[PDB]
Amino acid sequence: GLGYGSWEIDPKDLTFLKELGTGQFGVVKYGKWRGQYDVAIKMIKEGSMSEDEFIEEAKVMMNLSHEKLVQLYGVCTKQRPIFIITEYMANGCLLNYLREMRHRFQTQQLLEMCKDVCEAMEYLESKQFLHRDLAARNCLVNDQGVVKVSDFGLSRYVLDDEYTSSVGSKFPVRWSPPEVLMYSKFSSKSDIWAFGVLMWEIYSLGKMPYERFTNSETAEHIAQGLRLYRPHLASEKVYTIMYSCWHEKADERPTFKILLSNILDVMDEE
Ligand SMILES: NC(=O)c1ncc(N2CCCCC2)nc1Nc1ccc(C2CCNCC2)cc1
Ligand SMILES: [Cl-]
Numbered sequence: 001g002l003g004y005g006s007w008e009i010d011p012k013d014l015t016f017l018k019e020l021g022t023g024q025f026g027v028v029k030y031g032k033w034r035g036q037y038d039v040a041i042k043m044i045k046e047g048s049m050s051e052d053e054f055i056e057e058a059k060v061m062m063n064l065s066h067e068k069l070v071q072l073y074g075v076c077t078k079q080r081p082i083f084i085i086t087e088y089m090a091n092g093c094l095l096n097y098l099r100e101m102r103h104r105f106q107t108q109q110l111l112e113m114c115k116d117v118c119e120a121m122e123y124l125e126s127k128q129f130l131h132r133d134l135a136a137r138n139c140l141v142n143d144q145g146v147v148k149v150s151d152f153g154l155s156r157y158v159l160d161d162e163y164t165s166s167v168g169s170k171f172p173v174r175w176s177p178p179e180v181l182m183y184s185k186f187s188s189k190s191d192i193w194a195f196g197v198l199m200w201e202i203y204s205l206g207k208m209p210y211e212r213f214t215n216s217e218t219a220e221h222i223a224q225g226l227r228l229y230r231p232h233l234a235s236e237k238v239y240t241i242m243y244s245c246w247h248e249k250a251d252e253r254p255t256f257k258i259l260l261s262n263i264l265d266v267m268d269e270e
Contacts, residue, residue, distance in 0.1 A: 002033050002085075007062055007074035009033070009085050014041060014076075020092070024151065024158060025049050026081075030088060038088035039073060044081050050157040051082060057153065064127060068120035070140055070150040089140035089148065097141045098206030105205070107233055108270060109145070113202050114241075115263050116147040121195055122256035124152060125188055132156065132186060134194035135175050136201040173215040174208070178223040179250060189250035195259065196245025203231035203238065222246075237266050 002009070013034050020028040026045035033039045044051065061072045076083035091097055094113070098105075117139060124131060131138075133155040140150045155163070162168035166181055177193035179185040197209050209228055210218040227246055230239040241262050247253045254262070 002037055002039070002073050003071060007058070008078075009074040009076055009083075011076045011079060011083065014039070014083075014085075016041065024154065024163075025084075033073075033085070038090075040086045040088045042084040042086065044084060046081050048159055050159060051077075054154070054157040057156070060129075061153070064124070064129065064152075066120055066123040068116045068146070068148050069123065069152065070148045086150070087142075087148070089150075090143035091141035091145065093137060094139035094141055094147055095136040095201070095206050098136065098202060101205070107203075107235075107238075110202050110233065111238065111263065111267055113147045114199050115260070115267065117149055117195065117198060118256055118260045118263055120149040121191065122260050124149075125191075125256045128188075129153065130186065130188060131191050131194070133172055133175070134191055134198055135172060136198055136206060139198070167216075169215075171215070173219055174210050176219075177246070177250065178219075178248065181219045182223065185250075187250060188255070189253045192245050192253045192256065192259070194245075195256070196242040197228065199238075199242035199245070200228045200231060200234075203234040203242075205233070235266075241266070 015032045015035065016029050017032060018030040020030050020040065022028060023042065025042060025048045027043045029041045031039050031041045055075060055077060058072065058075060070089065071087040073085040073087065076085065121131070129152065131149065131152045138149065138151050139147050141147055158164055160170065163170040165171060166184065173181065175194040175197045177190050180190050200209060213221060225248065227243065241259065244254055
């Protein structure tokens, strides 16, 4: 089924309706399942993914369920290439959504985008599940403007060495705390750091972090104590929240449960 019964999905039940673009593993198409239900169809470019390891982990992701997590519906593994079938998010990638100036966002909307992500992240934390590549590019936006976290944990199965070497051209340097860039120490607290940068992305309407620095310069500078400036759209109270995510000591960073409380406190003042 589609979130019910088997999670090996029959490709014959799928109809391809539009190209959505490409992501980490290549082409993504919009389709319908059994003519009724919208789905996104991730066609996994062969050689890009550690497929056996992912399919085993997919059993684990099938059991995560939260409103603000993009739902994994199943896989199509009986063909070349394999497909991953997920919830359809009609407004696309959060990063691109933020950069479309026509939306004329209120800060009330930006803050709720942060709450959306923080709720998904608190749930993953409660399940001891790291995202490992949290950023605006890995969030999606549905037809109601709701933001949801996507492709949690999938960095573990990326075979492109430019993405997994901390010095590769594609490593999420700008979203990584010093202990990751320096020692490869991943934890819930490196997710917390990334969420702070993600909050800065949102309030910066999708500007790239540290845009005047190369990856290597950024890693050096954040390690010394350089930090992202307060976005003009972020109040002091909002900036204190993202800023708290970038403490030099991991154990001084908050949890996602604390961050959620902090965001809700600010929302409740409106
Ligand atoms: N699960 C999904 O719905 C979904 N997953 C991954 C993904 N992509 C492509 C972008 C890069 C990351 C991988 N796109 C997705 N949907 C999607 C939906 C609409 C658009 C259009 C709508 C008009 N304005 C924006 C463009 C683009 C992408
Ligand atoms: Cl800067």
